[PDB]
Write a protein that binds this ligand. Structure first.
Ligand SMILES: CCCCCCCCCCCCCCCC(=O)OC[C@H](CO[C@H]1OC(CS(=O)(=O)O)[C@H](O)[C@@H](O)[C@H]1O)OC(=O)CCCCCCCCCCCCCCC
Ligand SMILES: CCCCCCCCCCCCCCCC(=O)OC[C@H](CO[C@H]1OC(CS(=O)(=O)O)[C@H](O)[C@@H](O)[C@H]1O)OC(=O)CCCCCCCCCCCCCCC
Ligand code: FES
Ligand code: FES
Lengths: 288, 32, 160, 29, 37, 215, 32, 166, 166, 215, 160, 288, 37, 29, 32, 32
């Protein structure tokens, strides 16, 4: 979950490589998108949109292993400057768009890297962010130009508890090289099932494999499966995506002048041709 | 971040023609 | 109109020029005032302006600090390097890559020998040409995009 | 928040007006 | 790292030119010559 | 006043110069696309201009380059403009060249009296890409420092020499301060010159042979 | 977009106007 | 029915004009580019620095930088300005003929210029040699951890009339 | 009584020769100039460095650089070589198709290459993806304060035959 | 074999080129000293050569310049030679120019048909000294950092502008990293180019007018 | 001998050339093989060699680290800067220096107008010239050395 | 004296400026010269010569103020590498030249900056230094090329005791502004004379000026001399000089090859001309 | 800082040239012309 | 310690042999 | 450090002549 | 010095020799 990025990597959620630490636990793999505008003007509210899609009609395993639907979260870094715009600067139709959403700042004062989720998949399908652009004229040290935005969004449950031990959304391999005898199946009247399993004979050998309830099996009885061999099928239907994009804190005077200069040019070009036209004429008062 | 590329292309291409005809026509409106 | 003056097919020089492939700037509109001095500035000042505008609406970004221990994932030369890139990256014996790349410049030289057989400018009277040109061009664009895609999904461009 | 648009626009206009003017200028391709 | 609006711009004109280029190989393939060759 | 013209004329002979200019004629088949060359040119000079401009602020050293850039970006008067131009103008240039490569080929402009004018072209082109490449790394940021780290290996395939080549152009075994050094050299002094020689070839040859035939 | 368009139109518009506008303008006071 | 000189001439200036515009247009930001960014267009003068160009702890400074303090500061606008509880003014250590940093001479209560042989005071204020103008002066108050150097408008508590710097 | 071709021709080669000498003469040190100075033509391989490119205290290294040590060293000839009481060999962290530094993945006991998707071992030694050659290996003994990195001649305790580096 | 010559000749016209060369004659009064020009030239190209050479090792930053020099001096292959040359060749060059300025003047080579060829000369000369000066400081050692600190003030006399000028060419108020930056620019990209334009003038004008009269 | 071909005082062109100050490379030894291709390389390769040798016997030293708080005492631009230096340093109103310096380039221009009055190349038929040249030249060398000397002892060059 | 450079400035005897601290006490002013060869070969003995001249037939004041003749010293820094060559590598005629001389190393291990003196003026008029050049082939970190040498030499007694108080080789000014009454003259049966002096009347005023025996006076009785006014004449006839020079640790292979290349060139040049000579001929088989 | 062997070199040739230069203004001032002017 | 001399010498010899050869070459000033 | 400058000058100058005559003479020894 | 001289002499010497030496040498086997 979002907050555990926080909790295992404290200072930034994004590796030098571009990684994004989320990733680190969420080992699956699925499309993710941010849209922002192309330019925002200094000091405005604009929408910036995380898309984290999936087949809404589908469910993943839970702890015990029910088969409940699933939940999204993401982290979104906008550029130095950017913040979640003020409740009262959001105007209305946007306020509705944005929804019940818990925007949290990655660390105290990184007001521009925002955590989001868990938040439930069915309607948080995209996820809006009311964001308020900086002002290079009152923040002497915000500068105009174009800046990155890395998204890095995820849906469905993880593969590793911050503590270090496997979850159960994943597949469970094989403790041993060789031949199997018993596929047992505990259930200690609190922490649910446990299909256990054993292997043996070849190297002296007696040793065991407890495997949580969630996956299907695909294994049968007696197999000669070698160590760490696919014994479980694959529970996950969720996983992690990344995005990067570019937005442009545009000062308008630049545009304004530029526009001017575009006219000035149009206008000369006109003069030029016009001109040649007058000479296309005087020119023919000389072939006779 | 793909809706531009597309956009770009259309205009980049199509405008030529506008300018083209714009030219052409200008040309008609004058006599040769 | 325009303005225009015709060849001078009495000038035995223009002739022998024409003949060696070449008198072609001796007839047509005059290039003084005319082309150079009126419309050129239009092309320039035009060309300028687009870049100016291009630059101002979408100016030029700043990367992170390069780090020699972290490779970016997403890391692409610029555009007119895709084609080669594709080749280079996905052709798994290294000397073939080089070989194949140099072939671009080299080949591209040869052409006007190779294509020197007939005298024909027009891309129409040169079907076998215009074809190989077309073909090449595509394979180009294709490897092109191809470099934008991810390895495996690359050649297929994803669609087979 | 649409001087911004005028903006791209103007990029398009010159781009056009150019070709335009170029062709008009030499009765052109 | 990658720059759509450019790339668009590129194909856009690559076709356009490719285009009009043959448009005039034709337009002339085909009402040819005059004044002498 | 004093009659300036004549002044020159007595001495230098301004006059023939003017005639060589005014007497070059434009034929018929020469249609818009035969502006690509010139465009590519205009393109480049814009580079050269802004090129030089940034040579007054940019610092080619691995402690300094990356930041001077963002100086030019953030605190130099119009650096943002100036640098932004150099950036799109590079692109524009590589591309107007390709577009000109088209009008040459499908106009069969590259044929018998003129296979030199084409040969150069290729060279121009290899050089332009080169500017292009080297350029590209001087920011000594993440994206460009992986692209030198990438290509600079490529030649190592090539079998007697080929390392020596890489070593040549990276200035040691790994990438690093020599590389950038060498590269700034590259980019700001070698290619500016080479290009100019061959542009000069590419141009004379043309004033000499005139445009290619009609269609 | 739609406003792109409009703005566009309206922009070329004008210039196109000022062109024609000025031939005549120039033309019929005998300048072309 | 052709147009006369002064109308090819109108048209000429008409274009060549607008052209010129477009040009000076572009010319202009190019020119400003090339003029240097001015250090910080806020107050008048900056916080004063050492060799490395660091910032100077006003407590490590006194506890230890050479007997009755005659000492080198990287001050106003670059100029290493002499700095001498601290003193009112800064002496502005560059000579006033050519411009070599000039030295304190403890056994003379004078500055020399070597390159060429001018001399000054306790205070700046010349008194010999090719150099036609006192050394420079400027206040050195003492904000938070450090010193602070702001120019010297007040007329010259040492000449009578205007400072030559202002 | 004039000299014939092949004697204007003797004389020609006679000079043009010596000329050529003088030329290659000069040419020569120019060429060596431009080949890079080789790091240190003494032993085989250098003392191993961090980011800043410093030198690494072998006591601050273990006391603290990440659980069961998978860690980035600026080693041989530039190459950041993975370093993992310390281990025999260095793993030579550059991938062997294109050449991006490749990462340890603790929850897989594999290295990936991302740019493109190759994989390796505990040991280097490939096992998937476009890359046709184990990662690199090299000894990391431990002289005075620090580590020391010298190449790996001995044949590949992991392949059987010759290393591809030698 | 294939007859190469003709190849060219059909196309380019190599042949006239050769005739323009072989037909230029040498008169009588042209005596040893009329080698000064050429010498000055040879001089300069030696600069340009070695110039470029050091652009591959020298680092224009106030932490780095001074030392890279002594790198080139101490550890680069023949740097000592190469740098040592650039050094004496600069001197030789400034001086062969002065010596050529003599043979012009006391040969009255600078007179009516040819006051352009002299005007340039001066410009060449102002540029050469400029290379000269800027050059001179790039070591960012004691002697040269006092000589920029010295001249760079000089213009401040000049009354409306004159500071702005200094400020222009020192890139701020004091000397310092901008100065060196600017200067490396100077020295390795502006003057190399200017010089070449005007050398080009200075040369054409001469191929055009031929040598000055006899005595 | 040498080799030599005389003017062609029938060529009405050479004439009108001669006449406008100027046919001078139409007669004498030929410049091909002859001058260009045989003795030139001697001048070059010669010029080279001296510098080479110069460079190798007395190569190129390394200064101390520049220090912006210590002025060197002994601190001199290079040689062909002495003259101006002298002027500059010892002329005590600053604008005069500049003024006076620029005068070098500027003046030096003017000359060939100024000296344009007569047509006379030879330094002999131009006494008033050759004098001012001589004079100037000395004052030059003199201020020259003068900059090597110490201020006061400068003008006098020590000897009055 | 030499050793007090040592004792007041410990780490180097030469200031950033180029000064040389000697100077600092020795305030007078006189010519000084070092000669070394132009090149030394690596590893040799060569002479390097300090000249510290003066009018041998002349004397300066002493403590008490006799009027004994005077003594020289100098400090001489050669380049990193350089040392005083070994007793047995000096050969003979040089050993005599060099004399009884106490070469001392400025600080432990600056073996290449050498103190010298006091040493008496009459015969130490120049001062030889047997110096042994470095070897770039055994000292991997000595490099060939050309290096500086600063001299910085002095003759006659100083003006300031390391302690800080005036000596008596100098002149004694004036303690006060105004009018004088008594030119006394003590002599406490150990530290000799003391012509004292007083000033007074104008400002209230009573105050005193003790002035050591050495100078002449030039003052008479009653004067109206203003404060710090020339009251004493100038005792010193000694003082300090500086030199800098350049020497070239030459590797000989450089020379050797260079020489070669000089031949190679001579030799082509010859070929060239020769050649033209042959064409100067064939040329004249064509004017007939 | 200052460089004798150069400076020597400079005057040395400055005179030499100055020299021979007038030597030939003369040598020719004074057996002039021929072949036509 | 006089290869060193040969050294300067050679500087002088080329310097000479040059002029020499140059004059010989064009019978010269 | 002044005995060079002088030296220099003498040779720099005087040698020219040696070379000069050396030339001249060579020239005599050959015939024209 | 004196040895400068000698060496000098002896050096030019030789070349001068090889010159003359080679004219004839070349000359009288009909090459000039
Ligand atoms: C906002 C509004 C602003 C408006 C205006 C602003 C500014 C206006 C000032 C500019 C007007 C100048 C008029 C010049 C044209 C003229 O009179 O015709 C005479 C000639 C040619 O007539 C030519 O034009 C022809 C014919 S015709 O008369 O039109 O018929 C001709 O037949 C063609 O052959 C050709 O020879 O002038 C030219 O137009 C060609 C040269 C132009 C220039 C230069 C290039 C580059 C750099 C330049 C700079 C100058 C530097 C100066 C320095 C310190
Ligand atoms: C240690 C000892 C070493 C000894 C030797 C070493 C090396 C020897 C190899 C060199 C010999 C080549 C002979 C060429 C001369 C010839 O045959 O005459 C034919 C022509 C001209 O005859 C000319 O000379 C003339 C006449 S005559 O025959 O002498 O009479 C003529 O009349 C004159 O007009 C002119 O046209 O050759 C030339 O001499 C002129 C061109 C020279 C070259 C080039 C310049 C620059 C760069 C060049 C390089 C090449 C690159 C190659 C590439 C990959
Ligand atoms: S600068 Fe002060 S005296 Fe020369
Ligand atoms: S580099 Fe290892 S997979 Fe592309």
């Amino acid at each position: 979950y979002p907050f555990w990025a926080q909790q295992t990597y404290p200072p930034t959620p994004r590796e030098p490589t571009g990684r994004i630490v989320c990733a680190n636990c969420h080992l699956a793999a699925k499309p993710a998108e941010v849209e922002v505008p192309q330019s925002v003007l200094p000091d405005t509210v604009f929408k910036a949109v995380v898309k984290i899609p999936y087949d809404t009609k589908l469910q993943q395993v839970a702890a015990d292993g029910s088969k409940v639907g699933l939940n999204v979260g993401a982290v979104l870094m906008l550029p130095e400057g950017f913040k979640i715009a003020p409740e009262e600067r959001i105007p209305e139709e946007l306020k509705k768009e944005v929804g019940d959403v818990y925007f949290q700042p990655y660390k105290e004062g990184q007001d521009n890297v925002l955590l989001v989720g868990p938040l439930p998949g069915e309607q948080y399908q995209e996820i809006v962010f009311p964001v308020l652009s900086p002002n290079p004229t009152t923040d002497k040290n915000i500068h105009f130009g174009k800046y990155a935005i890395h998204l890095g969004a995820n849906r469905g449950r993880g593969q590793i508890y911050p503590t270090g031990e496997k979850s159960n959304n994943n597949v469970f391999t094989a403790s041993a090289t060789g031949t199997i005898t018993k596929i047992a199946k505990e259930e200690d009247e609190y922490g649910n099932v446990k299909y256990q399993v054993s292997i043996q004979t070849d190297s002296g050998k007696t040793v065991v494999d407890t495997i949580p309830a969630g996956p299907e099996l695909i294994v049968s009885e007696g197999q000669a499966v070698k160590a760490g061999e696919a014994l479980t099928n694959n529970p996950n239907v969720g996983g992690f995506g990344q995005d990067d994009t570019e937005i442009v804190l545009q000062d308008p005077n630049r545009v304004k002048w530029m526009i001017a200069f575009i006219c000035l040019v149009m206008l000369a070009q006109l003069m030029l041709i016009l001109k040649k036209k007058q000479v296309e004429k005087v020119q023919a008062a000389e072939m006779n | 971040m793909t809706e531009e590329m597309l956009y770009a292309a259309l205009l980049s291409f199509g405008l030529i023609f506008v300018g083209w005809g714009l030219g052409v026509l200008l040309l008609k409106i004058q006599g040769a | 109109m325009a303005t225009l003056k015709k060849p001078d097919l009495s000038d035995p020089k223009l002739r022998a020029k024409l003949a060696k492939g070449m008198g072609h700037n001796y007839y047509g509109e005059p290039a003084w005032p005319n082309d150079l001095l009126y419309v050129f500035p239009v092309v320039i000042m035009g060309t300028f302006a687009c870049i100016v505008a291009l630059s101002v609406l979408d100016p030029a970004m700043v990367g992170e600090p390069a780090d020699p221990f972290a490779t970016p994932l997403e890391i692409l030369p610029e555009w007119y390097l895709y084609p080669v890139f594709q080749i280079l990256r996905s052709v798994p014996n290294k000397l073939l890559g080089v070989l194949l790349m140099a072939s671009v410049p080299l080949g591209l030289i040869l052409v006007p020998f190779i294509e020197n057989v007939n005298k024909f400018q027009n891309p129409f009277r040169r079907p076998v040409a215009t074809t190989i040109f077309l073909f090449g061009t595509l394979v180009t664009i294709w490897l092109g995009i191809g470099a934008t895609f991810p390895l495996d999904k690359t050649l297929t461009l994803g669609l087979f | 928040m649409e001087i911004d648009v005028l903006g791209w626009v103007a990029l398009l206009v010159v781009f056009t007006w150019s070709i335009a003017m170029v062709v008009w200028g030499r009765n052109g391709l | 790292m990658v720059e759509p609006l450019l790339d668009g711009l590129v194909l856009g004109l690559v076709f356009a030119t490719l285009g009009g280029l043959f448009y005039a190989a034709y337009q002339q393939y085909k009402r040819p010559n005059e004044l002498g060759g | 006043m004093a009659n300036v013209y004549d002044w020159f004329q007595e001495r230098l002979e301004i006059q023939a110069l003017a005639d060589d200019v005014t007497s070059k004629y434009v034929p018929p088949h020469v249609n818009i696309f035969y502006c690509l060359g010139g465009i590519t040119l205009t393109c480049f000079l814009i580079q050269f201009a802004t090129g030089f401009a940034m040579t007054f602020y940019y610092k080619p050293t691995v402690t300094e380059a990356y930041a001077s850039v963002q100086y030019i970006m953030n605190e130099v008067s119009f650096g943002w403009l100036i640098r932004s131009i150099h950036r799109w103008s590079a692109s524009m240039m590589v591309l107007m060249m390709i577009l000109h490569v088209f009008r040459v080929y499908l106009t069969g402009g590259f044929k018998k009296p003129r296979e030199l004018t084409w040969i150069s072209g290729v060279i121009l082109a290899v050089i332009t890409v080169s500017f292009g490449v080297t350029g590209y790394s001087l920011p000594w940021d993440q994206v460009g420092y992986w692209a030198v780290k990438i290509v600079s290996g490529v030649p190592e395939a090539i079998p007697v020499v080929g390392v020596l080549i890489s070593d040549l152009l990276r200035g040691g075994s790994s990438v690093g301060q020599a590389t950038l050094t060498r590269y700034y050299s590259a980019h700001t002094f070698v290619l500016p010159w080479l290009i100019a020689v061959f542009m000069l070839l590419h141009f004379l040859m043309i004033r000499k042979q005139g445009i290619s035939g009609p269609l | 977009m739609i406003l792109g368009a409009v703005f566009y139109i309206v922009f070329i518009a004008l210039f196109f106007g000022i062109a024609v506008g000025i031939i005549f303008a120039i033309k019929s006071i005998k300048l072309i | 029915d052709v147009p006369d000189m002064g109308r090819r001439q109108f048209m000429n200036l008409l274009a060549f004009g607008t052209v010129t515009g477009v040009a000076l247009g572009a010319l202009y930001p190019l020119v400003k580019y090339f003029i240097p960014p001015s250090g910080g267009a806020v107050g008048g003068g900056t916080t004063a620095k050492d060799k490395l160009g660091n910032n100077v702890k006003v407590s490590k400074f006194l506890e230890s930088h050479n007997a009755g303090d005659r000492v080198l500061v990287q001050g106003l606008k670059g100029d290493p300005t002499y700095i001498v509880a601290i003193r009112d003014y800064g002496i502005n250590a560059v000579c006033t003929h050519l411009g070599c940093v000039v030295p304190w001479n403890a056994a003379e209560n004078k500055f020399k210029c070597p390159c060429h042989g001018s001399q000054y005071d306790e205070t700046g204020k010349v008194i010999r040699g090719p150099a036609p103008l006192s050394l420079a002066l400027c206040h050195a108050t003492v904000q938070d951890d450090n010193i602070v150097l702001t120019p010297w408008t007040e007329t010259d508590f040492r000449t009578g009339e205007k400072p030559w710097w202002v």
